Amino acid sequence: MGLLTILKKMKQKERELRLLMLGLDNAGKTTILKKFNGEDIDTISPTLGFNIKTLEHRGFKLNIWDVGGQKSLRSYWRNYFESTDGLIWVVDSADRQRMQDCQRELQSLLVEERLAGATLLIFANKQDLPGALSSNAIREVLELDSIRSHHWCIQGCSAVTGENLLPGIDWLLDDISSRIFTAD
Amino acid sequence: LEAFGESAETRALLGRLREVHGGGAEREVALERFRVIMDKYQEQPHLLDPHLEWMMNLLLDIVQDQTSPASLVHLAFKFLYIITKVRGYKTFLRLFPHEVADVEPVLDLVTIQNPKDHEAWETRYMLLLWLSVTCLIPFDFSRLDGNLLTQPGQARMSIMDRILQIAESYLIVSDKARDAAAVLVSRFITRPDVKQSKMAEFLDWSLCNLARSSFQTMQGVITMDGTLQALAQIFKHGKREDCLPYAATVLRCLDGCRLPESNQTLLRKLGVKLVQRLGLTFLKPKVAAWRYQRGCRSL
Amino acid sequence: VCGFSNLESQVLEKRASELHQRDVLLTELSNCTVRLYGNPNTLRLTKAHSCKLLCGPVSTSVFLEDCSDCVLAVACQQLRIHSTKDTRIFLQVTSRAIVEDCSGIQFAPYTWSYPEIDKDFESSGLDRSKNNWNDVDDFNWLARDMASPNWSILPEEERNIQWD
Ligand SMILES: Nc1nc2c(ncn2[C@@H]2O[C@H](COP(=O)(O)OP(=O)(O)O)[C@@H](O)[C@H]2O)c(=O)[nH]1
Ligand SMILES: [Mg+2]
């Protein structure tokens, strides 16, 4: 293969990204995915497996893979780590008892091999609730300061009203564009 | 071009497959027109992304109908393969159905296929790919099977065993469907439950096929090529700590196949490819510390 | 969260003023009967044993865990259940109920109502013309022809259970 075709393939692959959405069940992953696209929220059902979506944002082709956060599904998350440019970890603020379980889950996702070089965007969903933990609370309970091998950044949101959702994707794209992309 | 202009024509042609399937007088002209209209976007397949979702829905509703004859379902499989080769299987099969309920029906179709039917090979190929899409579900095959001892005496075969047998039977065909099987090898043998019950068996069979195959007969060469492709897919889409315990045994069989002295250029490429995947299994992936400070993603 | 916990032989109750758009959580309840006359946003019934919960419409989700010999009757958009054995549920789901690691669940329609239930359904943004209670998915059983042996329907002769 010549240099022209190699450059063409590199440019074609550069215009494609992968944003794997993970998190515990009943967190609001499907709701966020539907609000970011503009679909209806009153007709959403829990994923019995995993859903896929494709869209275009700022010229970049974003492919989102929303996996179920059920107990019997976590063991299969490894089947979605190949070619992952971003990891959207959703955390429910109202969920305060299972937090410890949500901290162990995000901590093990960071010691993986395929997910070594990939941005991290943590969405504190359900922020408009009375007993919704603040951003600092979720940052300290999950121990985000200890993270050093990945570029993380916490940011609350609320899919019920579509707030603080565009800034997260904008920051993810800015961080992805800050590093060099080389084929393999 | 800039956008898709032949929208109504393509829609009418796709809605005409139900009246041009019996006689081939109006079946060949439709295929020729579809190919001529699709070849114009061979260099710009990205311009079809916003049309390849509704065309796949129309093509799937025809093959999913139980009252759709063999000749009608095979016509819908040729158009699907055409769209795949035009746009791309990696970007086309990703949008295909991937629910759980689509695990048993699709498989059943793969069971009612004649490998000695060259007039409908496009049906055997694309179908396999669709199966590989239904192995990205986060559940086990034992849960879908349920109770297998429902009939007296003759027990029911699980879905895992059926998929394994189908893959073992199609990695040794001459047609384009062997390649599809390699896709299923990277989607089936890499699963959590399938690997636990179909990794030692699949790796003992591959070693045996590599040990008793010659590069001087037509069949043996096909079997060796299929086995090498399956091993490469396993080592690529597989884990390093599940595949590392086997990389020394595989390396040995590969070296024993004395490929660097064969006059088969494709066997040598597969051997080299399998030699670099096995090698990368002996070392942990590292990350370029030199990024975020020497250039952006684009220019 | 706003709810009771660590109680026994206690019949609790709330009004719409302390239930409106507020996440609710129950934990460690034995032989108790709760009555929430409002529209709680979310509901979480954990570690329940011989407890009868009669809650009004729930705008989002109802989660149940470690429940046994319970009698639930709440309407919502989704109902998640984990580790539950023998627990009747008068459910009115606008989307879908799911069950995991369950066995012996009995699903039946929803018939509970209070004088002010009309002004509380308007607060749930729910659709009264949607009830898929007779269509629950099982994560442990994903067959095509055979049914799920972990959940069934309650007979019409066992649905006239006392609400007192
Ligand atoms: N109050 C509130 N509820 C939400 C929000 N986002 C999602 N939910 C609800 O939480 C429940 C779980 O949502 P779902 O998308 O099924 O999450 P997933 O299936 O875990 O990814 C759904 O009923 C949503 O309507 C939010 O911002 N606020
Ligand atoms: Mg979901």
| Pocket lining for ligand 1, CB < 6 angstroms | A 25-31, 44, 46-47, 69, 125-126, 129, 158-160; C 41, 60-61, 77-78
The rounded distance, in Å, linking the Cα atoms of B109 and B115 is: 13
Distance from CA of C157 to the nearest CA of A (A): 31
> Looking at chain A, which subunits does it touch, using at least 3 CB pairs closer than 8 Å as the criterion?
B, C
| Exposure letters A88-127 (e unless 16+ CB within 10 A, then b) | bbbbbbbbbebbeebeebbeebbeeeebebbbbbbbbbbb
* Chain C CB contacts of A96 below 8 Å: 1
Residues B131 and B109: beta-carbon distance below 8 Å? no
Check: CB of residue A36 under 8 Å from CB of residue A165: yes
Q: What is the distance between the alpha carbons of residues B72 and B79, in angstroms, rounded to a whole number? A: 11
Q: Give residue A46 CA to ligand 2 midpoint distance, Å.
A: 4
Interatomic CA distance for residues A17 and A60, integer angstroms = 7
Token pair listed for B22: 């019996």
Taking contacts as CB-CB distances below 8 angstroms, the residues of chain C near A43 are 95
Distance from the C77 Cα atom to the nearest Cα atom in chain A, whole angstroms: 8
Query: φ, ψ for residue B194 (rounded to 5)?
Result: -65, -40
CA of B235 from ligand 1 middle (Å) equals: 38
* Interface test with chain B among C98, C100, C139, C142, by most B beta carbons within 10 Å: C142
Backbone angles phi and psi of C154, in degrees to 5: -85, 135
Rounded Cα distance, A109 and B248, in Å? 29
CB of C26 closer than 8 Å to CB of C53:
yes
Mutate to test the interface with B, among A60, A180, A181, A184 (most CBs of B within 10 A): A180
Helix runs in chain A, H state only: 3-14, 29-37, 71-74, 99-108, 135-141, 166-178
Question: C13, C37 in Cβ contact below 8 A?
Answer: yes
Cβ atoms of B34 and B82 within 8 Å: the answer is: yes
- Asked if residues B97 and B132 have their Cβ atoms less than 8 Å apart, the reply is no
The chains found to touch B (3+ Cβ pairs under 8 angstroms) are A, C
Rg of chain A, C-alpha, whole Å: 17
**Looking at the partner chain, which of C23, C96, C139 has a beta carbon nearest the beta carbon of A94?**
C23
The identity of residue C164, as a single letter, is D
Hey, what are B116's tokens?
A: 């000695």
Helix (H) or strand (E) holding C120: helix C117-121
Q: A70 catalytic, yes or no?
A: yes
What SS3 class is residue B211?
Answer: helix
A84 is in an annotated binding site: no
Question: Residue A136, annotated ligand binder?
Answer: no
Please report the atom of ligand 1 found closest to the CA of residue A34: 15
CB contact under 8 A, B240 and A113: yes
Residues in chain A: 184
Whole-number Å distance, alpha carbon A31 to ligand 1 midpoint, is 5
The residue whose two tokens read 């109802």 is C62
Token pair for residue B252?
């040995």
What radius of gyration do chain C's Cα atoms show? Answer: 15
User: Among A179, A175, A180, A169, which residue's Cα sits nearest to residue A56?
Assistant: A169
Which amino acid residue places its CA nearest to atom 12 of ligand 1? A26
Report the chain A residue with the minimal C-alpha distance to residue B137. Answer: A49
8 Å CB contact of B146 and C143:
yes
Give φ, ψ of A44 to 5 degrees: -125, 135
Helical H runs in chain B? 7-14, 27-39, 54-63, 70-86, 89-92, 104-111, 121-133, 141-145, 159-170, 177-188, 192-198, 200-211, 218-237, 244-256, 265-280
Q: How far is CA B209 from the centre of its chain?
A: 21
Distance of alpha carbon C153 from alpha carbon C108, whole angstroms: 6
Give residue C95 CA to ligand 2 midpoint distance, Å.
12
Instruction: In whole angstroms, give the CA distance from residue B206 to residue B226.
Output: 9
Neighbours of C84 (CB within 10 A): 25
| A24 known ligand binder | yes
Which atom from ligand 1 is nearest to the alpha carbon of A127?
Answer: 27
From the CB of residue C43, how many other CB atoms can be counted at a distance below 10 Å?
24
Cα dihedral across residues B127, B128, B134, B140: positive or negative: positive
Q: How far is the CA of B158 from the centre of ligand 1 (A)?
A: 36
CA distance A63 to chain B (A): 10
Tokens 């492709």 sit on residue: B229
Assign 3-class secondary structure to B234-257: HHHHCCCCCCHHHHHHHHHHHHHC
Phi, psi at residue C141, to the nearest 5°? Answer: -120, 115
- Residue by residue, DSSP assigns B155-170 as PPPPHHHHHHHHHHHH
Whole-angstrom distance, CA of residue C153 vs CA of residue C156:
9
**Ligand located closest to A93 CA:** 1
- Answer for the pair C95, C77: CB distance below 8 angstroms, yes or no: yes
Tell me, in Å, the resolution of the deposited structure. 2.2
CB-CB contact of B93 with B133 (8 Å): yes
8 Å CB contact of C78 and A130: no
Sign of CA dihedral A168, A169, A170, A172: positive
> In terms of CA atoms, which chain C residue is nearest residue B101?
C144
Cβ–Cβ under 8 Å, residues A49 and A68: yes
Method used to obtain the model: cryo-EM
DSSP secondary structure, A41-61, as one string: SSS----SSEEEEEEEETTEE
Residues of chain B positioned with their CB less than 8 A from the CB of A181: 297
SS3 A18: strand
User: Which residues of chain A neighbour C98 with C-beta distances below 8 Å?
Assistant: 46, 48
SS3 of C73, please?
strand
Structure tokens at A46: 């829990």
- Residues B223 and B200: their CA atoms lie apart, in Å, by 19
Inform me whether the C-beta atom of residue B137 falls under 8 Å from chain A C-beta atoms.
yes
Q: Look at residues C152, C105, C107 and name the one whose alpha carbon lies nearest to residue C132.
A: C107
Cα separation, B84 vs B78, in Å, equals 10
Q: Give the Cα separation of C51 and B241 in Å (integer).
A: 48
Q: Which residue has the tokens 């007296």?
A: B152
Give how far C116 is from chain A: nearest CA, Å. 23
- Enclosing H/E stretch for B175: none
Task: Please report which ligand is nearest the Cα atom of A159.
Answer: 1
Min distance B113 CA to chain C CA atoms (Å): 22
SS3 C4: coil
Axis-axis angle for helices B244-256, B265-280 (nearest 10): 150
- Whether the Cβ atoms of residue B279 and residue B236 lie closer than 8 Å to each other: no
Up-side HSE of residue B47: CA atoms within 13 Å toward CB? 14
* Residue A23, marked binder: yes
User: Taking a C-beta distance cutoff of 8 angstroms, is the pair C35, C54 a contact?
Assistant: yes
Kindly give the number of the ligand 1 atom that is closest to the alpha carbon of A125.
Answer: 27
Tell me the CA distances in angstroms from B33 to B38, B72, B185, B240, C103, one per residue in order. 9, 18, 35, 48, 57
Contact B101 C146 (CB under 8 A): no
List all residues 6 or more positions away from C109 whose beta carbon is below 8 Å from its beta carbon: C90, C91, C92, C131, C133, C159
Q: Which of A30, A112, A22 is nearest to A73 (CA)?
A: A22
Which candidate from A46, A70, A131 shows the least CB-CB separation from C1?
A: A131
Q: How far is CA C127 from CA A40, B203, C57, C97, C141, in A?
A: 14, 55, 11, 16, 29
Region for B174 from its dihedrals, namely left if φ exceeds 0, alpha if ψ lies in -120 to 50, beta otherwise = alpha
**A contact test, residue of C21, C77, C99, C102 with most A CBs within 10 A:** C77
Note every long-range contact of B24-32, with CB atoms under 8 Å and residues 24 or more positions apart, other chains counting: B27/B75, B31/B78, B31/B79
- Give the distance (Å) from ligand 2 centre to CA of residue A145: 28
CA distances from B294 to A6, B290, B298 (A): 21, 7, 12
- The span from the CA of B35 to the CA of B19, in Å, is 19
Amino acid at B249: T
| Strand positions, DSSP E, C10-145 | 24-30, 33-36, 43-49, 52-55, 61-73, 75-90, 92-103, 105-108, 137-138
Q: How far is CA B50 from CA A29, A96, B53, B96, C54, in A?
A: 25, 42, 7, 15, 49
> Which atom of ligand 1 is found nearest the CA of A31?
15
* B:145-204 residues touching chain C, CB 8 A cutoff: 145-147, 150
